[PDB]
């Protein structure tokens, strides 16, 4: 199916406590594969998936050199933004950057992204055409001007449409065991009396990959959206995900309810019932 590669960068200023904290992480789909932490001893880009451990020193030295440059950029950016927004030197502020590329089921380039946020809100983003910029406010219009004159979008377009997707395809092949896999949800249901006249039915999806899943309850075939407790999909720690959906049912009505599970790893959508 479809795939993506994404890098995420966070820098947080630490006035009086040294240089800003910088953390970079890279993903292919829902699988992390590299990290850099400014506060760690190694000062190197590091593997976080087994398939990337096979890349040689030339890859790791190159990623380390580039990630330090991303770090430097954010150090400059924090000072710039502080200036643009007339903020004091005392406060901690956050710059975030994300970029990457999507390929479709044919593995061909589908979409590219490159976006920046300051203190949790949009600052500037490359439009989907990869040729123009969305400036969130008046300060960002200044960055937009600078970047338009320096033809920054042209350089990003060439990466997002080219090397981004070439590397994504390389990773897909080298990590085929990890990345071209699906883990279908293992499902179960639990029943727990919450009083003499009500019971909780909890429908579970465990050990699935990728994270995308749809879990719903029906009563007599009618969707129970506004009556269903749904937790956010959550990582298990081992590369798989979990989720559950619960309904409180009047004792005696258990048979009216069905849980429906949709996931790429299933041969067909599941319908589960308590007896």
């Amino acid at each position: 199916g479809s795939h993506s590669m994404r890098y995420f960068f966070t820098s947080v200023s630490r006035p009086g406590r040294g240089e800003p904290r910088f953390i970079a992480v890279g993903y292919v789909d829902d699988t992390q594969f590299v990290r850099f932490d400014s506060d760690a001893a190694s000062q190197r880009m590091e593997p976080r998936a087994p398939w990337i451990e096979q890349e040689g020193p030339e890859y790791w030295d190159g990623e380390t050199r580039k990630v330090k440059a991303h770090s430097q950029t954010h150090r400059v950016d924090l000072g710039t933004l502080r200036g643009y927004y007339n903020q004091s030197e005392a406060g901690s502020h956050t710059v975030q950057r994300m970029y990457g590329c999507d390929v479709g089921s044919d593995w061909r380039f589908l979409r590219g992204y490159h976006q920046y946020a300051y203190d949790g809100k949009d600052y500037i983003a490359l439009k989907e055409d990869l040729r123009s910029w969305t400036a969130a406010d008046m300060a960002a219009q200044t960055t937009k001007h600078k970047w338009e004159a320096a033809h920054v979008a042209e350089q990003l377009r060439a990466y997002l449409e080219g090397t981004c997707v070439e590397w994504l395809r390389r990773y897909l092949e080298n990590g085929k065991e990890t990345l071209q896999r699906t883990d279908a949800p293992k499902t179960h249901m639990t029943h727990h009396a919450v009083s003499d006249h009500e019971a909780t039915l909890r429908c579970w999806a465990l050990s699935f990959y990728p994270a995308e899943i749809t879990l719903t309850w029906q009563r007599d075939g009618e969707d129970q959206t506004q009556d269903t407790e749904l937790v956010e999909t959550r990582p298990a720690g081992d590369g798989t995900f979990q989720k559950w959906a619960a309904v409180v049912v009047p004792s005696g009505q258990e048979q009216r309810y069905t849980c429906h599970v949709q996931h790429e790893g299933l041969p067909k959508p599941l319908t589960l019932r308590w007896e």
Binding site: A69, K146, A150
Partner: peptide, 9 residues
Amino acid sequence: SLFNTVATL
């Protein structure tokens, strides 16, 4: 593989 980043805000 990372972009060869150059621009600052």
